[PDB]
Design a protein around this ligand. Sequence first.
Ligand SMILES: [Ca+2]
Lengths: 48, 98, 21, 98, 48, 49
Amino acid sequence: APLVAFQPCIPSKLCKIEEADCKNKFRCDSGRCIARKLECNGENDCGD
Amino acid sequence: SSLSQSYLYIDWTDNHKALLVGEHLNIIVTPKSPYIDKITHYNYLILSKGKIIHFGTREKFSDASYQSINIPVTQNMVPSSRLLVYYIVTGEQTAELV
Amino acid sequence: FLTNANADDSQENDEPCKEIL
Amino acid sequence: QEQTYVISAPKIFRVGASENIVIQVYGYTEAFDATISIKSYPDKKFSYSSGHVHLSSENKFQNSAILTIQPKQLPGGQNPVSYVYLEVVSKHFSKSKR
Amino acid sequence: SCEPTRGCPTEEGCGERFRCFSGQCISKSLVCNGDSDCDEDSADEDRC
Amino acid sequence: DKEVEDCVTNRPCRSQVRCEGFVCAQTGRCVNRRLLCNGDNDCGDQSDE
Ligand SMILES: [Ca+2]
């Protein structure tokens, strides 16, 4: 049998999560804030 | 920009000159679509201030044209009003709100 | 609107509108 | 996707206003019912207003409910409620939206 | 054969996501990615 | 092992299952409208292209 179980829920609170807003860094489409030196570097450094 | 290339064009001329209270408005609407076999009617909503004040349905005639929007412009419309018209149509499996 | 026919206006957000009539 | 629905509502609900909410269903050939409803958010604990509507060939599978948030039934407090759920329940479907 | 009390459930739509022809939903970042990102018959690659 | 003959018909028929697709000219296949002009024969007898 399973050792952990999950059930749907009607929650009872909001979400307090925040955006990256990551200063000088470059936000990849996956949200990873890679170093600005890697913008147009010619290798895929976002993975994306 | 219909992904299904299915459209609903309101034939009206958008006029800045007012309709008179209680008069019959008569608007044609043409549902051009790949799937006109399935559009047995379109539906319409008349919105005045914030509220959907009238709603209804408009059936296909055998000539492949539809009941026009034939409504008296009743007193609840008087500063201005807005007409919206819509249908859902099916492909073989997919569907689009037009 | 709420519909199962493949759209949701949740993808759109307001502007301080100025188109005039 | 042969069976489908639309519910259409004001962009913002005004508290204390008699908001009218249209329903249209498609692809159905036996009559049924739905309960368009306004509920508290996040929790869905409190139904602020609910209406019960019959969908049939005789209604051309269209209806509307008139629903309101009574100003005193909101929980109030120091910073006021900014969101609410519009829900539908029916045989065949349910969904809700902020 | 039987007359059901309980009704047949509907689909729900892909909303802001791209609907593939199967009924599965994929992110609009994957449309015209140059990969067949919908399983089975790609549709994400159509007429780009 | 079988014999077949024609008749006059006094009964209705509904045999046309419709096609939201495209009806291929020779084969009568209903291809989905996205399959036209893909550079490929989906009708069996090339009619989609
Ligand atoms: Ca083809």
